[PDB]
């Protein structure tokens, strides 16, 4: 459940930059 | 850590779900 967990978080992170790109994108 | 880890989970979930509203907004 650890791993599973620590998985999830660096998928959620993950989306967290690409989504602050696309404001990026979106801002310029 | 697996509580600890949950709740880091929430609170990253809590951004993207700002980062979603954050771009509906800038695309409306
Ligand atoms: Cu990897
Ligand atoms: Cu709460």
Chains 1, 2 share one sequence.
Request: aromatic share 0%.
């Amino acid at each position: 459940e650890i791993a599973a967990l620590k998985x999830e978080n660096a998928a959620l992170k993950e989306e967290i930059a690409a989504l602050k790109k696309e404001i990026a994108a979106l801002x310029k």
